[PDB]
């Protein structure tokens, strides 16, 4: 029955992330949709937000004056433009939460400190499954963030999934793992379904079964105290179908591809910083 | 009022007994399990839960109303010969064995009594957290009420739907073997997290959460998985770079290979 | 045809190669321009493309200056390394009325404006990236407007180029990526159609039928996607029946990394375009 | 011709695509089409329903409704269908099998048990009939009249390219234009991913890639040139395109498409067996 | 030209496709036959190859029987699966004088003699494997003589076919392998020349020049080897200077298994020919 009585939230950016978080927060019951405002405007996401009850506006300054907690849900290269546009509208009360991949706390604070000293900044990396309250979020607190700010951020983002504080220099690696992770899974689920269809399953059933399989396996591991290799061993019977299929995954270097992916996403994130 | 029996007391019977009791569909002590090996760790875990154990398959048959066969495919004909004479009118015999056809079971049971009620099912271990993926097919003598009971039971521990029996070998290669594909994926994702500087514990937690959230997102969405992939991939961004490296390794083809190989091996077992 | 006609517009082409013939043929076929309001100039007035233009009734000249004096809208349809020589040649002949439309891959608006501003301030420059299928009115074109382009200039250029295909304005820093996708795209398709026909022939079809069927398949699929609200993967799903022929063939494409090769190609063309840009 | 009624045994994606195309071409009214399926819970059945197509669970009703009867079920179901409604075939019927792999001979053999001289046509078409740009071939059976072939060609030409072929080409056509649109949808998704990787919005990338393919295909159809000559025509020396063509060649791109046509054709021959 | 002239020889072609035009064009160019002593027949008397034959002055007819009655040497220039239908059609029209020269890939002398012997004993049959470059008098041909071929028949056929290229007698059981090497060889070369030209274009050559240079290189190298007493690897050594451009490029061919692909191709064509033979 958590509810943030005094909190007004703003989103600068009204895209996939802003929609997902607002949907997750209101689904959780921690915020009413009308205490949320977003800015952008003929966008698909912006049409959905209006249905939820989220206030909307084409003016980033209005989002800023509305908001206590202010999410910057824009692309990495737009962040500097945003900070210069509303930097003079930042007030003591604002917590500026940057969601942009790769953009450092140091740089946001540099840009905002030209307007007022000690802006309160948090960097976060979340993902779209917050829209079903199963996101994966990490955050790091900035130089002038108050101790209550990180706790407030964690209580809010925990309502829509996993959330934990990390040192900032981990966030690029988290981006390559849980930020890009859902995309890896959507690709895997499409391919698994193609597999089921090749072997004679109707597409709709193959998609449902593959997604249920992944969901159940992920929950099993989250609820288990066991190594994922131990769960693999437990479900593989001698001579059986599963160990045969695991061999063909191994023969294509399946494991190395996923390592390559996490690495490539992390490295590109570091390039976006620079 | 219904009582459940397991012939076989391995990972599947544990997982199903744990899920059924967790769902509250029946009490641990209304379940009975028999195994040739009373020293397996799954048997000791069943004991802890409060499930009744016996070495005698006949005891399980006479205890049970719904009787699951959770033994290895090549054991099924020996089990059917052992307790065929003890099947009664009331029994619904649910074979969980990969590859084994309703026809072959009905033929062996029919030697002892006409009209055995047989259901064939393919499920997976995540029933242990009530998120299994189950399909079933009803046999010649299975009443319509039998399929409904079966679906209501297996829905308490995850997704459950009736299929034509000729789909079950392919289901085996997708959701039967699927969790093992995911556990492999999760170990490798965590290795990638660790390579890039994350502590192992956090990397495992984030990868598992990413997969759980993605799967739930897809189940709750009306969108194609490629559309979701498109929605979360920004231009020039980190995710589309990493998807390119998956593509360059033929990632999709490996998962197709896996489903095919597990399905083909399942067909070899019958 | 297109229910447009630019009655007061003289169009000039510097360069009389494949692209100039493709655009002139598309414009005249669309009815938006009469071939005699078009003039083209070429250093090789013997190219096969020059013979066809003459047949169409396009005016031809060996003198780039004569094309400039004739035209209002001036298409620079030359190779990227030649744009600087052309601008030095006719830069003093640009007048207030001229809209200079550079078609050269990679050449930035910045660089054209810099070379032209040596002769006259405020040249009106547009950068476009189009492709040869404008010759059958199914081109794909993007454009970006320069510093001194008037608002009406980009609107006029979009009207003209939409008569021969898809056309939209983009930020200039997207054009290198577009070059890699729709600029080089037809060549990817011609390679694919040749290979698909070889496959049809291997399995016993006459070559003519195989080329016809393969091209019709690609045309129909592309039209289906354009007219659909669906994701290409949904359409892929919709047409792959369980256990069937199509899903078996899709598996062999996946085993070869088919998707990754197409991503590689867009990337390689885009990166090469950026190298020409420097 | 004005009284012609069409039936589909099968209410899947092909039945929908053909019904959509036929009615878009104004060939006949949606209510002059009847489709049957064992599963009425299909989305394509919902699509057909909203179109105005009459729907039934009874193949016999579809047979009695129709004059031109399309068989648009999976290859392994055809023999059960033929046994089920073979006694309901009448002299007016033209039976058009769309099933992959299934031979005219085998259809005539099953139907001949019920009535001499069944009029059978085999065709291979594809989903783009839904936008009237299908690729269709057909072969006429033993008892098909010359009029039947002409009617067949007029009907399937209203929704795209259509030509008569020897039956022994149809398996290969299946691997080329039957499966072709799926190869293109895969290619278009990948091309879009490449455009997005290089900084384009997804929506624009899909649009540009589809337009590129549509235009290239139309150019080739309208050209008297070899596709390799058109490739040469648009490949400038040292340029972006020839660099990208090299990376396609380095991956064996051409051989993958050959492999795909071959694999689809071979599978089609297995479905027959 | 060739200082031969078969003044009493009437030649017939059943089939009027690429191979019939290639041979007729080579024979008449060599001067060994006048186009009017040649007759060709085709089921499609509208093929482009039929238009050219008519231009040459070759007699044309839709009736295979009329070609048979006209000719002394009778070339069967049809697809392997059609040879049996042709032999059933004209078998009763074969006379003592006829030499039946089958060009079809894979079809054995045995099978032709069996089908023809149903009508007349002792048909004179020759099996040959040639290629399209006979059209420029640089074909590569082998032949094997049948059971009832007279000694003079194989000598006559070698005289005729040597006027348009290399020609030699082989045991019939070598012809499938020859098909894989010189029968399919020109197609390997056309593929190689297209790829080499693409390479020249990538590195900045105009396409026309690149095709010209690549073809001249291949022609010159093949002529060097034919006129040399040396092993091709010795010639490779002789032209690769230490540390130089050529040896660097040879390394990248080796890294791709270039040699193994060419071996694979000969093998695949030979094995396919054997499958057609069955
Ligand atoms: Cl995401
Ligand atoms: Cl499992
Ligand atoms: Cl082009
Ligand atoms: Cl299709
Ligand atoms: Cl040849």
UniProtKB/Swiss-Prot annotation, chain A:
<dbReference type="GO" id="GO:0005759">
    <property type="term" value="C:mitochondrial matrix"/>
</dbReference>
<dbReference type="GO" id="GO:0051881">
    <property type="term" value="P:regulation of mitochondrial membrane potential"/>
</dbReference>
<comment type="pathway">
    <text>Amino-acid biosynthesis; L-proline biosynthesis; L-proline from L-glutamate 5-semialdehyde: step 1/1.</text>
</comment>
<protein>
    <recommendedName>
        <fullName>Pyrroline-5-carboxylate reductase 1, mitochondrial</fullName>
        <ecNumber>1.5.1.2</ecNumber>
    </recommendedName>
</protein>
<dbReference type="GO" id="GO:0004735">
    <property type="term" value="F:pyrroline-5-carboxylate reductase activity"/>
</dbReference>
<comment type="function">
    <text>Oxidoreductase that catalyzes the last step in proline biosynthesis, which corresponds to the reduction of pyrroline-5-carboxylate to L-proline using NAD(P)H. At physiologic concentrations, has higher specific activity in the presence of NADH. Involved in the cellular response to oxidative stress.</text>
</comment>
<comment type="subunit">
    <text>Homodecamer; composed of 5 homodimers. Interacts with LTO1.</text>
</comment>
<dbReference type="GO" id="GO:0005739">
    <property type="term" value="C:mitochondrion"/>
</dbReference>
<feature type="binding site">
    <location>
        <begin position="99"/>
        <end position="101"/>
    </location>
    <ligand>
        <name>NADP(+)</name>
    </ligand>
</feature>
<keyword id="KW-0560">Oxidoreductase</keyword>
<keyword id="KW-0225">Disease variant</keyword>
<feature type="binding site">
    <location>
        <position position="241"/>
    </location>
    <ligand>
        <name>L-proline</name>
    </ligand>
</feature>
<keyword id="KW-0496">Mitochondrion</keyword>
<dbReference type="GO" id="GO:0055129">
    <property type="term" value="P:L-proline biosynthetic process"/>
</dbReference>
<feature type="binding site">
    <location>
        <position position="60"/>
    </location>
    <ligand>
        <name>NADPH</name>
    </ligand>
</feature>
<dbReference type="GO" id="GO:1903377">
    <property type="term" value="P:negative regulation of oxidative stress-induced neuron intrinsic apoptotic signaling pathway"/>
</dbReference>
<keyword id="KW-0028">Amino-acid biosynthesis</keyword>
<feature type="binding site">
    <location>
        <position position="40"/>
    </location>
    <ligand>
        <name>NADP(+)</name>
    </ligand>
</feature>
<feature type="binding site">
    <location>
        <position position="40"/>
    </location>
    <ligand>
        <name>NADPH</name>
    </ligand>
</feature>
<feature type="modified residue" description="N-acetylserine">
    <location>
        <position position="8"/>
    </location>
</feature>
<feature type="binding site">
    <location>
        <begin position="12"/>
        <end position="17"/>
    </location>
    <ligand>
        <name>NADP(+)</name>
    </ligand>
</feature>
<feature type="binding site">
    <location>
        <position position="60"/>
    </location>
    <ligand>
        <name>NADP(+)</name>
    </ligand>
</feature>
<keyword id="KW-0597">Phosphoprotein</keyword>
<feature type="binding site">
    <location>
        <position position="101"/>
    </location>
    <ligand>
        <name>NADPH</name>
    </ligand>
</feature>
<dbReference type="GO" id="GO:0034599">
    <property type="term" value="P:cellular response to oxidative stress"/>
</dbReference>
<feature type="binding site">
    <location>
        <position position="75"/>
    </location>
    <ligand>
        <name>NADPH</name>
    </ligand>
</feature>
<dbReference type="GO" id="GO:0006561">
    <property type="term" value="P:proline biosynthetic process"/>
</dbReference>
<feature type="binding site">
    <location>
        <position position="234"/>
    </location>
    <ligand>
        <name>NADPH</name>
    </ligand>
</feature>
<keyword id="KW-0007">Acetylation</keyword>
<keyword id="KW-0521">NADP</keyword>
<feature type="binding site">
    <location>
        <position position="14"/>
    </location>
    <ligand>
        <name>NADPH</name>
    </ligand>
</feature>
<dbReference type="GO" id="GO:0042802">
    <property type="term" value="F:identical protein binding"/>
</dbReference>
<comment type="similarity">
    <text>Belongs to the pyrroline-5-carboxylate reductase family.</text>
</comment>
<feature type="binding site">
    <location>
        <position position="16"/>
    </location>
    <ligand>
        <name>NADPH</name>
    </ligand>
</feature>
<feature type="binding site">
    <location>
        <begin position="73"/>
        <end position="76"/>
    </location>
    <ligand>
        <name>NADP(+)</name>
    </ligand>
</feature>
<feature type="binding site">
    <location>
        <position position="17"/>
    </location>
    <ligand>
        <name>NADPH</name>
    </ligand>
</feature>
<keyword id="KW-0346">Stress response</keyword>
<feature type="binding site">
    <location>
        <position position="242"/>
    </location>
    <ligand>
        <name>L-proline</name>
    </ligand>
</feature>
<feature type="binding site">
    <location>
        <position position="168"/>
    </location>
    <ligand>
        <name>L-proline</name>
    </ligand>
</feature>
<keyword id="KW-0641">Proline biosynthesis</keyword>
<feature type="binding site">
    <location>
        <position position="74"/>
    </location>
    <ligand>
        <name>NADPH</name>
    </ligand>
</feature>
């Amino acid at each position: 029955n958590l509810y943030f009585q005094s909190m007004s939230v703003g989103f600068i950016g009204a895209g996939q992330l802003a929609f997902a978080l607002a949907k997750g927060f209101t689904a959780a019951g921690v915020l009413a949709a009308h205490k949320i405002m977003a800015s952008s405007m003929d966008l698909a996401t912006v049409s959905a937000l209006r249905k939820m009850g989220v206030k909307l506006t084409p003016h980033n300054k209005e989002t800023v004056q509305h908001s206590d907690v202010l999410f910057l849900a824009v692309k990495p290269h737009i962040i500097p433009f945003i900070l210069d546009e509303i930097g003079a509208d930042i007030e003591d009360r604002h917590i500026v939460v940057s969601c942009a991949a790769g953009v450092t706390i140091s740089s946001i604070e540099k840009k905002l400190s030209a307007f007022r000293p000690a802006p309160r900044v948090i960097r976060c990396m979340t993902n779209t499954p917050v829209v079903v309250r199963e996101g994966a979020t990490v955050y790091a607190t900035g130089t002038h963030a108050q101790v209550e700010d990180g706790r407030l951020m964690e209580q809010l983002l925990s309502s829509v999934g996993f959330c934990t504080e990390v040192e900032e220099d981990l966030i690029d690696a988290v981006t390559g793992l849980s930020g890009s992770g859902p995309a890896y899974a959507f690709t895997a689920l499409d391919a698994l379904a193609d597999g089921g269809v090749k072997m004679g399953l109707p597409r709709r059933l193959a998609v449902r079964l593959g997604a249920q399989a992944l969901l159940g396996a992920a929950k099993m591991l989250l609820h288990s105290e066991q190594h994922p290799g131990q769960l693999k061993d437990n479900v593989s019977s001698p001579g059986g179908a599963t160990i045969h299929a695991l061999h063909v995954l191994e023969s294509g270097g399946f494991r190395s591809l996923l390592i390559n992916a996490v690495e490539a996403s992390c490295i590109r994130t570091r390039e976006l910083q620079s």
